[PDB]
């Protein structure tokens, strides 16, 4: 997260860390949607142009975390994966279309003050909340700047970061990039003339873009951090997987499995 700030403890209890076993490194964000299912971006796990193809045994999922690096003995739960499911029509060749994946935990996690699932939206929520100019929230442990001076600058955050960003009109999204955008994506960020900044960055991918409904007080996952071009560039916007448009696939996978 570029130009965000420190999360409060428990502010995002559905935030999941994808953790590589060997070498030990932060892979990506994810989110908790029930006691045994985790939602993330497909490109976190599978991207053949860079020979990236992670397996159930390559990864741990860490839930309830605040610190990026500490083993938070009293608070976090570490789980292994039973099975990974990638959208069958996930398009890694040209635009990261349908950038979505589900992961089933080997055992259920116990909820607590620090571990709690986010809601997926229904039709009415999606139609009310997904409108240009409205703001959602992005969280993660990814980089604080696109680039920095080696061994001097920082870098990676020490605790979870948070930034609030407005949804941007579809035509402005389209004009900002040569990449072919589909209806399975939306874009968010400030416009160059607005004098605020903020973006997701490396390591934030797969994490949740969430919105709060004023009428029932619940948080909904509307997007997944998918892609962009650098971090926090002027006249550039982050792109997000459209969770609602892909809800039917989620429903199939959870029901069948």
């Amino acid at each position: 997260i570029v130009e965000g700030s420190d999360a409060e403890i428990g502010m995002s209890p559905w935030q999941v860390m994808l953790f590589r076993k060997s070498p030990q490194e932060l892979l990506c964000g994810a989110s908790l949607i029930s006691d045994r299912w985790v939602l993330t971006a497909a490109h976190c796990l599978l991207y053949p142009p860079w020979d990236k193809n992670f397996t159930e045994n390559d990864l741990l999922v860490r839930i309830g975390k605040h610190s990026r690096t500490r083993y938070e003995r009293n608070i976090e739960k570490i789980s292994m994966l039973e099975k990974i499911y990638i959208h069958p029509r996930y398009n890694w060749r040209e635009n990261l279309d349908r950038d979505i994946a589900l992961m089933k935990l080997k055992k259920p996690v116990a909820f607590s003050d620090y571990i709690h699932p986010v809601c997926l939206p229904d039709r009415e929520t999606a139609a009310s909340l997904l409108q240009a100019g409205y703001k959602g929230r992005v969280t993660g442990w990814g980089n604080l700047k696109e680039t920095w001076t080696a061994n001097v600058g920082k870098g990676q955050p020490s605790v979870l970061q948070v930034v609030n960003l407005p949804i941007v009109e579809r035509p402005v999204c389209k004009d900002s990039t040569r990449i072919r955008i589909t209806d399975n994506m939306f874009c968010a960020g400030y416009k160059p003339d607005e004098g605020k900044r903020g973006d997701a960055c490396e390591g934030d991918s797969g994490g949740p873009f969430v919105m709060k409904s004023p009428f029932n007080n619940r948080w909904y996952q509307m997007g997944i951090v998918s892609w962009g071009e650098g971090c926090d560039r002027d006249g550039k916007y982050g792109f997000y997987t459209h969770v609602f448009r892909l809800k039917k696939w989620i429903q199939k996978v959870i029901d069948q499995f």
Partner: peptide, 11 residues
């Protein structure tokens, strides 16, 4: 720079 986690998970 990660603190180590129980090696049961990493073996």
């Amino acid at each position: 720079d990660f603190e180590e986690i129980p090696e049961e998970y990493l073996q």
